[PDB]
Swiss-Prot record, chains A, B:
Organism: Homo sapiens
Name this polypeptide is given: Ataxin-1
Note: Self-association seems to be necessary for formation of nuclear aggregates which are associated with pathogenesis.
Entry's induction text: ATXN1 protein levels are directly regulated by PUM1 protein: PUM1 acts by binding to the 3'-UTR of ATXN1 mRNA, affecting ATXN1 mRNA stability and leading to reduced ATXN1 protein levels.
Lineage summary: Eukaryota, Metazoa, Chordata, Craniata, Vertebrata
Cross-link (Glycyl lysine isopeptide (Lys-Gly) (interchain with G-Cter in SUMO)): K49
Source taxon at top rank: Eukaryota
Disease: Spinocerebellar ataxia 1: Spinocerebellar ataxia is a clinically and genetically heterogeneous group of cerebellar disorders. Patients show progressive incoordination of gait and often poor coordination of hands, speech and eye movements, due to cerebellum degeneration with variable involvement of the brainstem and spinal cord.
Residue ranges of every copy of the AXH domain listed in the record: 2-128
Parent-protein start and end of this portion: 562 to 688 of 815
Length: 128, 128
């Protein structure tokens, strides 16, 4: 079948040394974020909730530098296949920042990443 | 409420109130970013390689609150159709933060936001 395409640009906070303001008034550098920062920040926020998507499959795209990743999204495991840039950092539950290509994420952002793998649970924040 | 969305498709809400570390070591509040903060070169030449994507078309989606955006991506203009929640913030060359629904982006990200338009050239802040 035909995957959905992800946004073709990356947001700026992935740049190492950027500082996030969490819904606990706390400030952390992006490279220092932990899983509990998201969970606690979501818990406190009246607007945001935590959700998650599990990596089911990673395949090469026909475009070089792009992966096709199959996700199982949220508690009913809705199946979504998306084209994503290999440098895109996902935040993996109990791991931290992870990408299809850590070396490229290092080149672009200086953000240390683990290699994204099948079974990884990626954290997201969505509106209520 | 809207269709299943992979992690990189979601607006990055938690970048609200972030401080971005620019390639040169400067710091900028995310709402204060300018096009020049994206450009390394202190004097743009026709040398200047930018990675960008240009908006070609914007349509309503069957799903409410979601827009479908066609992009021409990169130097070779790959055609990519991207479905996103309308508040998704793009940084536009010569314009700044823009979206398919400025009002909602401003309230959710606490920044000034323009309407995304056909012709808008969308960029990412990176080292590159
Ligand atoms: Na919450």
């Amino acid at each position: 079948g035909s995957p959905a395409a992800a946004p073709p640009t990356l947001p700026p906070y992935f740049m190492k040394g950027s500082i996030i303001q969490l819904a606990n008034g706390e400030l952390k550098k992006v490279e220092d974020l932990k899983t509990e920062d998201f969970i606690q920040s979501a818990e406190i926020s009246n607007d945001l909730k935590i959700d998650s998507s599990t990596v089911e499959r990673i395949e090469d795209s026909h475009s070089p530098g792009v992966a096709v990743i199959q996700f199982a999204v949220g508690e009913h495991r809705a199946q979504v296949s998306v084209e994503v840039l290999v440098e895109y950092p996902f935040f993996v539950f109990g791991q931290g920042w992870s990408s299809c290509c850590p070396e490229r994420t290092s080149q672009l952002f200086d953000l240390p990443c683990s290699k994204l793998s099948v079974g990884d649970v990626c954290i997201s924040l969505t509106l209520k």
